[PDB]
Each structure stands twice: as structure tokens, then as C-alpha cells.
Ligand binder design. Structure first.
Ligand SMILES: N=C(N)NCCC[C@@H](NC(=O)[C@H](CCCCNC(=O)Cc1ccc(-c2ccccc2)cc1)NC(=O)Cc1ccc(-c2ccccc2)cc1)C(=O)N[C@@H](Cc1ccccc1)C(=O)NCCc1ccccc1
Length: 215
């Protein structure tokens, strides 16, 4: 696999979004992975609706602003037969009644793939598939106050990941890291991104809940 990978360079990634004060990170991680796979297939990058997922994927197991899973979001898109665009179904940072309208559906999926729980496997998926949805342990002050550099929290756990994010690549500094897109706005970290420690024993559990949709 390549020494460095950055899908942002190829047009697979939308600008950084902001989930605000709502536990919908799983929806932002899911739209991020879908935006990438839809792009790989059609050559068109279209921002997708996190609100649609928040309001309508309860049957699949999600709990709107009180939590969810990226895999549940992917299953919803398949079950539902579509997912609306961000433009057609704006984000409100609060759960509301389902307003899905197939007329504005711009993405879909025929299943999803759960990646083996090894950084090596995550690296191959990132190198061959595109941006990958993952969960990390962001349960620490240091993550909330992060601004720059390779994030490495000594107290990180590879078993209690509590925050869904998107791996858009990986690289090394002149020391290895995963390039991660967060959903906390562009004023957090590096324009909304964080360089998470790579090949440091699955630091913060980055490889333990990695998946992507098949479109
Ligand atoms: N640990 C679990 N399981 N809990 C999940 C909660 C729900 C949701 N995510 C979220 O909600 C994420 C949380 C993320 C990170 C938060 N980090 C911290 O809390 C650590 C920390 C500690 C101290 C200091 C601190 C700072 C300064 C001073 C002092 C102290 C700083 C930082 N949300 C946010 O980032 C948003 C957020 C957080 C707080 C408030 C708020 C508002 C008004 C008043 C007061 C507080 C508003 C918005 C979510 O669903 N996350 C997914 C992540 C995931 C995706 C895919 C696979 C695995 C895991 C999840 O956990 N899914 C499993 C659970 C679930 C399944 C189905 C249905 C529901 C739930």
C-alpha cells in the first residue's frame, strides 16, 4: 500500500461540517463515507443529509441526537431506497419528524463492509476504497482542546470508542498518522481535522469499528 494517501486531493471529501450540540456524529461519519463512495461511482461530489438520518433511521437502531452507529445509517439508506441531499433536507441539530422525500434522493447503498479490527486492514481499505467511517476514543479533555500535531493520548482506550469520524487518508511527518475529518466545525483542530497516531497499537481504537458502504 502507498506510503501516503489523502482522498481530499482527489475530490472525494466535502468541506468540514458541524454537528453542533447533538449526538449525531454517527450521521456525519456515515454521510462522509457515502459521499466518498458515491463520488467514486459517479464522479460527482454531493453533500448528503445528516438530518434525514437523524429523523428517519430509528427503525434501524439509531437514536437521533442521543446516539447511533454508522452501520445503522448505511442499513437505513438501503432499507429506505435512498437518502436526500443536504440542500433538500437541511441540518437542524435536533431530532424532528421524518421528512424523507424520494424526489430529492441523491445517494443509495446496497450494503456495507465491516473491516477486520487491525490497523493493517484499515490501511488497505483506506488505500483501495476511499474515506472510511471509524469510531475513536474522544473521551478526554485533550481531544476537546486539540489544535494541531499528531494526537496521542496516553490514557486512550481501544475498547470504549465514543465518537464517529472519517478517515480520509494517512501519512507521515518529518511520526505516522491517520488523517481524520471530524464534525465539530472548522474552528476545532486543523480546519476541523486531526492527525491521529498511526501504528501505535490501534491507538484510541481507530481500527476497531471501521466500515464503509457499498453503493
Ligand atoms: N460512549 C458511548 N457509547 N456514548 C455515546 C453517546 C452518543 C453519540 N455521540 C455523541 O453524543 C458525541 C460525543 C462524542 C465525544 C465526546 N467526548 C467526551 O465526552 C469526553 C470528554 C469528557 C470530559 C471533557 C472535559 C473538557 C473540559 C473540562 C472538563 C472535562 C471533554 C471531553 N456528541 C458530541 O460531540 C456532541 C455533544 C456533547 C455534549 C453536549 C451538551 C449540550 C447541552 C448541555 C451539556 C452537554 C452537546 C453535543 C454516539 O452515538 N456516539 C457513537 C460513536 C460510535 C460510532 C460507531 C461505532 C462505535 C462507537 C456511539 O457511542 N455509539 C454507541 C452507542 C449507541 C448505539 C445506538 C443508539 C444510541 C447510542
Amino acid at each position: 500500500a502507498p506510503r501516503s494517501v489523502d482522498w481530499r486531493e482527489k475530490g472525494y471529501v466535502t468541506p468540514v461540517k458541524n454537528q453542533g450540540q447533538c449526538g449525531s456524529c454517527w450521521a456525519f461519519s456515515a454521510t462522509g463515507a457515502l459521499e466518498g463512495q458515491m463520488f467514486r461511482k459517479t464522479g460527482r461530489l454531493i453533500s448528503l443529509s445528516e438530518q434525514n438520518l437523524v429523523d428517519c433511521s430509528g427503525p434501524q437502531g439509531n437514536e437521533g441526537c442521543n446516539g447511533g452507529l454508522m452501520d445503522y445509517a448505511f442499513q437505513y439508506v438501503q432499507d429506505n431506497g435512498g437518502l436526500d441531499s443536504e440542500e433538500s433536507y437541511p441540518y437542524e441539530a435536533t431530532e424532528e419528524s421524518c421528512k424523507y422525500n424520494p424526489k430529492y434522493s441523491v445517494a443509495n447503498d446496497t450494503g456495507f463492509v465491516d473491516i477486520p479490527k487491525q490497523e493493517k486492514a484499515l490501511m488497505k481499505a483506506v488505500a483501495t476504497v476511499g474515506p472510511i467511517s471509524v469510531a475513536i476514543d474522544a473521551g478526554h479533555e485533550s481531544f476537546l482542546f486539540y489544535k494541531e500535531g499528531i494526537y496521542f493520548e496516553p490514557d486512550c482506550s481501544s475498547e470504549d470508542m465514543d465518537h464517529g469520524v472519517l478517515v480520509v487518508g494517512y501519512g507521515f511527518e518529518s511520526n505516522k498518522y491517520w488523517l481524520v475529518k471530524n464534525s465539530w466545525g472548522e474552528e476545532w483542530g486543523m480546519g476541523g481535522y486531526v492527525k491521529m497516531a498511526k501504528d501505535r497499537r490501534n491507538h484510541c481504537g481507530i481500527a476497531s469499528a471501521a466500515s464503509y458502504p457499498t453503493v
